[PDB]
């Protein structure tokens, strides 16, 4: 969810807590992303705010082209690699985590996306679907 | 459409009042005290500020 995330998303399994490392899915020059927080989280003692498919989070680049480092930058999750249940009755998951760089307004700094993109992310974020590749 | 004939009537209940400075309550323009008890039936009342 969050600002600019028009429409709503059905809840799915949370499989990306604070401190996860995610492969860089888009051609922004980065190699991995380090999740520091998630948008629209809760407040409970000793609970890591976790992320999921289609969610937008801010993640630093622990390993990538230099001036993409040492600073916070929001991103959008395109793969989860964690079994989540759709309404249609399927328990599916991806091969690995993947995220795409995106400013808070919702558009993408990158140009293209490599690998499958969950349609729970394409539907929720229109610009991700604009620059998406494989759709599930 | 302004029709200021009813503005003097609409403002009769909205603006033409007085306010007690401590309790911040609406009072009649000619009231000498405040009807509430939290403020303590005060003597000082400020007129409602006019527009602009």
């Amino acid at each position: 969810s969050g600002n600019g995330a028009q429409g709503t998303k059905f809840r799915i399994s949370l499989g990306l807590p604070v401190g996860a490392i995610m492969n860089c899915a888009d051609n922004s020059g980065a190699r991995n992303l380090y999740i520091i927080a998630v948008k629209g989280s809760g407040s409970r003692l000793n609970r890591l705010p976790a992320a999921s498919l289609g969610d937008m989070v801010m993640a630093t680049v622990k390993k990538g082209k230099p001036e993409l480092r040492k600073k916070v930058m929001p991103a959008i999750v395109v793969r989860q690699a964690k079994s989540w249940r759709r309404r249609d009755g399927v328990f599916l998951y991806f091969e690995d985590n993947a995220g795409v760089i995106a400013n808070p307004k919702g558009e993408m700094k990158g140009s293209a996306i490599t690998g499958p993109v969950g349609k729970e992310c394409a539907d929720l974020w229109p610009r991700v679907a604009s620059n998406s590749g494989v759709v599930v | 459409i302004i029709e200021p004939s009813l503005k003097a009537l609409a403002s009769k209940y909205n603006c033409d009042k007085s306010v007690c400075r401590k309790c911040y309550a609406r009072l009649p323009p000619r009231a000498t005290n405040c009807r509430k008890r939290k403020c303590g039936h005060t003597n000082q009342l400020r007129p409602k500020k006019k527009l602009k």
Binding site: - | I2, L6, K7, L9, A10, N14, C15, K48, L51
Partner: protein
């Protein structure tokens, strides 16, 4: 100061009659009949000249004597209700959004429907009490008329419609729109 005796004189017009039982009062007139219970004030009544009814209080304090006059006020105020009738007129105030006010009957409720007030999509319904009727002004735009034979029933129904149109989280001194009392008149055109 424990006033020894205080009195007021009620004048009874020849067109109506008033019935007294202990502290229950009923008036009978051409327009109708209303009854009020005044057992919560502890006043005394007396009939002397048919058209004159005298209210008295013996050994009453200052606060209690203040209630003596209001007993006369309400009794005399409903005397004109049963004799002349009461007619309150409202006017509709708005800046950009016209207000639609109608009368709608839902299961015999006589609800006053308010639509498009400040552009609000929510509907506003105000019940019409017993003995009060609502009419529209002649050849004058956006003016409702509340015609009733009672004093408190008409006036309370009048205020209820006024207070149903409020402004939420805005500047009161700028958005003057709503609905307000314009004229407190009687049913009788001459009086």
């Amino acid at each position: 100061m424990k006033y020894i005796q205080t009195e007021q004189q009620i004048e009874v017009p020849e067109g109506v009659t008033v019935s007294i039982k202990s502290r229950i009062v009923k008036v009978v007139g051409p327009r109708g009949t209303l009854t009020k219970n005044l057992k919560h004030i502890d006043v005394t009544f007396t009939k002397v000249n048919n058209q004159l009814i005298k209210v008295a209080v013996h050994n009453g304090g200052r606060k209690h004597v203040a209630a003596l006059r209001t007993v006369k006020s309400l009794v005399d105020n409903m005397i004109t209700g049963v004799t002349k009738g009461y007619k309150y007129k409202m006017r509709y105030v708005y800046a950009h959004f016209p207000i639609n006010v109608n009368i709608v009957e839902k299961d015999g409720a006589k609800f006053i429907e308010v639509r498009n007030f400040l552009g609000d999509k929510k509907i506003r319904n105000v019940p019409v009490r017993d003995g009060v009727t609502i009419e529209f002004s002649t050849n004058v735009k956006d003016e409702i008329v509340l015609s009733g034979n009672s004093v408190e029933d008409v006036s309370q129904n009048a205020a209820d419609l006024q207070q149903i149109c409020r402004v939420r989280n805005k500047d009161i001194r700028k958005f003057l729109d709503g609905i307000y009392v314009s004229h407190k008149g009687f049913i009788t055109e001459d009086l």
